[PDB]
Symmetry: C3
């Protein structure tokens, strides 16, 4: 299991969501963040820009799927399109039922 964290432009949320659900990736967590990349917030002094952070936990088999769909959906081709961080998840538990791992993600 992996966690996928993607920072994207806020207006791209809808397209990203649709692309993931259509590919059978259903379950994600969204929050509001500010940030900068290599260009230090310049569309020198350094600025933070509004972004959205998507968090998506899946089975290792699905990681490349999640990455492609976000990239396809979030790319405009201008600087500040986002960045994606894949990190390990040791264990997932659904709270309602107590199911673990594969059963908690499907």
């Amino acid at each position: 299991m992996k966690k996928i964290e993607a920072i994207i432009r806020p207006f791209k949320l809808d397209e990203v969501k649709i692309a993931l659900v259509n590919a059978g990736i259903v379950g994600m967590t969204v929050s509001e963040v500010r940030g900068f990349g290599r260009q230090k917030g310049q569309t020198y002094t350094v600025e933070f820009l509004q972004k959205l952070k998507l968090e998506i936990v899946v089975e290792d088999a699905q990681v490349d799927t999640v990455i492609d769909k976000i990239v396809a959906a979030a790319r405009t081709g201008e600087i500040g399109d986002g960045k994606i961080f894949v990190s390990p998840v040791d264990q997932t538990i659904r709270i309602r039922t107590g199911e673990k791992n594969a059963d908690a993600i499907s």
Copy 2:
């Protein structure tokens, strides 16, 4: 060391916090997020986000099952959307005020 990340119904934060603290787990970070799971935002094609709270608690390996059990007992209501919990590795914890590390930075 591990990070436990629990997404829960917002109203359940108080109970969750007291349960954790009374079990000796003391240090957590909370943020407002939106989300959906399997049922796509529906309690009732469409997919919607609902407001959830995300709890992050970094603890030692030996405390993980305690954190999980306490969050589950406090957070469950019995209905879809009760939450989900992810445990992930943490290499290093550092207390900024003293520069203390790891077990002494969590204790």
Copy 3:
């Protein structure tokens, strides 16, 4: 690759941003969070555990930069009073820059 998460006092954001960028650490994500540590949101006695406003910094870097990031975070954010903050380091398997599809070292670099 490591993710550094630092929970700091909100008014320290600028000092941290300056210290880090000047050390060659350029790329960061900030969010608003609430928290308590060992002293349970406190500072007469007091009985409720309270959440206080904090900022979460997330900085992904190459392994060779972890020490610099911690040093600069400590120096910028410390005040000597409780609640100064906590830093968590955790592994990153893969980084992808969405504009180009560059990965890992390229996608963390300034190039």
